[PDB]
Design a protein around this ligand. Structure first.
Ligand SMILES: [Zn+2]
Length: 29
């Protein structure tokens, strides 16, 4: 439900980092 509302699911822990589909706190996606 919060695909764009909330930030990435992990963000800092996320493995994608730059290749993430969600919105990051420091990166765009
Ligand atoms: Zn991410």
């Amino acid at each position: 439900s919060e695909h764009r509302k909330q930030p990435c699911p992990y963000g800092k822990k996320c493995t994608y980092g730059i290749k993430c589909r969600f919105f990051h706190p420091e990166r765009p996606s």
